[PDB]
């Protein structure tokens, strides 16, 4: 019932975190991460998250 | 094509002209409206939405 | 820019690009016919590489009424100035490198479309 | 080796919207085992285990 | 795996992968407008080049500046290796490295319509 | 001083060179000779080339063309003034002739072009925690599916269940 | 997967296809003719003289010259073939049965383009007009694949599929 939480806020702590890497890549920010192409890059990050 | 389809599907719940089976498709991005009356096709029951709210009333 | 097909006016067949030899211009001759028309362009040909294309021009203003499609308040139009405004992603084949959103005013006889 | 894929018009499911990469609209199971599945993502669980 | 030098850094590196891999003219071109220029400083897209410089059609292609600096090549090379694709056939009047535009333009000298088509290809 | 020419390219180079550099009147502000600047810029020209072909030809028309250039009147005054003398000028390239305005968006464009083909360093969190079997150095990165350890140092790879 | 309705013919699977390299060509795939022919002949057979008059069943906008440079390749591509009936010749000149005299092979090549091709159209004796439409269509279509201002279809999607139950089996 501790570890429910820290779950919980972790789980949201990552929906929250994809939510800024969409902002980016939907305002053009999102930088190619050498190596990709833009919509490779974003998979990399949400799959990182 | 916003007459059509307000049409068509009205007649598709009111039972008469187009028969309960029939599924009519609205394209948006492309200008095409299909629709399909022909056998073989996999549908399903849904219930319909109007403002945000079912027509599933308790009557 | 571009070169469009000029159509013949006797037939109605295709012209060619035609250089006069000893007048030393640009015409349009056909196949079928012998209708000679005189050129304009001095551009025969041409060829985007790049492939640099605009979607604004392919978005049709009839996306506004799409159930299935999220709507934003946040960005209004510029024409009239409705709040409402539908939005999605190129949404074609083709896309370069571009997660880049599109835009349309969601209010009827506007149909007003915007990148930002 | 991707996430699920748009197997309708730029979405996965017909309870989603077009152009939707979240976690949960692509295949992030987010619940356990105990707490059970959510529909969708049990659809999603599915097509991962097939 | 490199050798020596070009082992440590970046940079001297790059340049060897830019000596392996196939770069093609259409990785740095742009744009290919075929153009019925009846003489060479008509310049019928405004460009300066001819005049100083100086067949009545002429191959219009404009280069790219990110892709031609990224491989490190300037129309000098460009040029003489189009000149030795196709011989005492063809001549190109390149661009400076100072404009803007990274134009070329190609004229023959020594079934004329399609031939620049078939040549461009 | 540049020796006397008798070839008839030759002179109508340095003519050309000369015409070049009294393109918007700088010469008279700093009063140097252009007709023996011109003269020296295409014997250096010559000395390098040795021929009055093509290549020749191109050479002499692209330092024309980049004295004349409109957006670069500082190269022409560079040269007027001696700061770059006229053997340099003679075999400096498009690049090193170019505006400073072009020549640092090139050498940006260089530098974001090798920044993009850089491959991303493969994430996972750093730790001295572990200590690498085959260096004995303690840095290392792992991450847990299980934890894989990868060493920074020898590219030495381990797990530990 | 053209079909009519449940007819003594039948599917024809036609295909309309682009070719990969001049460059950039269309063919037609049609049904028993030996092999495909391309696209702009097809309609030359169907009755349009003209140049002007096949691209406004293909091309619904003249105003984009996007898709105008797209067809030339092929629109070159058929400029020997300007009537009817010289067209007939060369969609009759490669059925299975070829015919021994030219009539034989023009009343073959003008049955196939009326029974055989695109019978969900029509099979009736004037129905060229309806037909020229749904061919413009499917050309319509690919060029708008090429262009790659459309997504490519998905053949595992069950929307494009049907269920041959007890009714249709039998
Ligand atoms: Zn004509
Ligand atoms: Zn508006």
């Known amino acids: 019932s501790k570890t429910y939480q820290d779950i919980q806020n972790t789980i949201k702590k990552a929906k929250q975190d994809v939510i800024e890497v969409i902002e980016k890549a939907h305002n053009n920010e999102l930088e190619p991460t050498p190596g990709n192409t833009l919509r490779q890059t974003f998979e990399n990050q949400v799959n990182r998250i | 094509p916003e007459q059509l389809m307000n049409t068509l599907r009205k007649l598709r719940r009111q039972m008469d002209i187009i028969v309960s089976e029939v599924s009519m498709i609205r394209d948006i991005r492309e200008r095409e409206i299909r629709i399909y009356t022909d056998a073989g096709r996999i549908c399903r029951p849904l219930l319909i939405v109007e403002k945000q709210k079912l027509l599933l009333k308790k009557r | 820019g571009f070169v469009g097909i000029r159509f013949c006016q006797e037939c109605n067949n295709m012209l060619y690009p035609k250089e006069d030899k000893e007048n030393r211009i640009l015409l349009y001759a056909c196949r079928n016919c012998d209708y000679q028309q005189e050129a304009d362009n001095s551009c025969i040909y041409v060829n985007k590489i790049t492939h640099e294309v605009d979607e604004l021009t392919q978005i049709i203003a009839d996306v506004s009424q799409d159930p299935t499609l999220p709507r934003t308040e946040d960005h209004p139009c510029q024409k009239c100035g409705h709040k409402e405004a539908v939005f999605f992603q190129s949404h074609s084949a083709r896309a370069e490198d571009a997660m880049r959103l599109y835009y349309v005013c969601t209010a009827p006889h506007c149909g007003h479309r915007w990148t930002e | 080796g991707k996430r699920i894929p748009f197997g309708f018009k730029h979405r996965t499911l017909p309870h989603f919207i077009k152009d939707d990469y979240g976690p949960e609209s692509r295949g992030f199971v987010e619940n356990s085992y105990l707490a059970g599945l959510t529909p969708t993502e049990f659809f999603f669980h599915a097509m991962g285990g097939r | 795996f490199l050798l020596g030098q070009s082992a440590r850094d970046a940079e001297r590196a790059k340049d060897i992968l830019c000596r392996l891999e196939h770069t093609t003219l259409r990785k740095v ?24 410089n100086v067949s009545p059609w002429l191959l219009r292609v404009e280069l790219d500046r990110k892709h031609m600096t990224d491989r490190k090549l300037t129309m000098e090379q460009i040029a003489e290796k189009i000149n030795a694709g196709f011989g005492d056939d063809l001549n190109c009047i390149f661009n400076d490295d100072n404009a803007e535009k990274l134009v070329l333009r190609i004229r023959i000298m020594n079934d004329d319509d399609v031939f620049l088509r078939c040549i461009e290809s | 001083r540049a020796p006397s020419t008798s070839d008839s390219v030759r002179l109508k180079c340095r003519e050309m060179l000369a015409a070049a550099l009294r393109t918007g009147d700088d010469y008279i502000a700093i009063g140097a000779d252009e007709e023996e600047l011109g003269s020296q810029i295409e014997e250096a020209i010559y000395q390098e ?16 063309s980049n004295l004349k250039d409109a957006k670069n009147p500082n190269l022409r005054k560079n040269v007027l003034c001696g700061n770059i003398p006229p053997d340099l000028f003679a075999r400096m390239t498009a690049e090193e002739m170019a505006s400073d305005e072009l020549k640092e968006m090139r050498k940006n464009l260089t530098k974001e072009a090798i920044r993009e083909h850089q491959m991303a360093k493969t994430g996972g969190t750093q730790t001295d925690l572990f200590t690498c079997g085959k260096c004995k150095k303690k840095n290392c990165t792992y991450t847990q599916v299980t934890t894989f350890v990868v060493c920074n140092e020898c590219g030495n790879r381990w797990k530990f269940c | 997967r053209s079909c009519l309705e449940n007819s003594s013919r039948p599917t024809s699977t036609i295909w309309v296809s682009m070719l990969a390299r001049i460059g950039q060509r269309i063919v037609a795939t049609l049904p028993y003719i030996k092999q495909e022919v391309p696209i702009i002949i097809v309609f030359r057979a169907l009755g349009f003289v003209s140049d002007r008059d096949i691209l406004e069943h293909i091309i619904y906008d003249f105003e984009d010259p996007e898709m105008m440079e797209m067809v030339k390749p092929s629109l070159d591509e058929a400029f020997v073939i300007q009537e009817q009936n010289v067209a007939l010749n060369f969609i009759g000149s490669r059925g299975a049965k070829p015919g021994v005299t030219k009539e034989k092979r023009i009343k073959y090549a003008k049955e196939v383009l009326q029974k055989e091709m695109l019978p969900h159209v029509g099979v009736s004796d004037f129905c060229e007009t309806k037909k020229a439409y749904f061919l413009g269509y499917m050309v319509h279509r690919l060029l708008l694949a090429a262009l790659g201002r459309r997504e490519l279809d998905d053949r595992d999607h069950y929307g494009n599929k049907r269920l041959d139950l007890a009714g249709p089996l039998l």
């Open chain 5, 29 to 52: 071109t742009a744009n290919t407008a075929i153009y019925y220029d009846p003489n060479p400083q008509s310049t019928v897209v405004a460009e300066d080049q001819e005049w100083v």
């Open chain 6, 49 to 64: 080339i040795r021929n009055t072909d093509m290549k020749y030809k191109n050479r002499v028309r692209s330092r024309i």
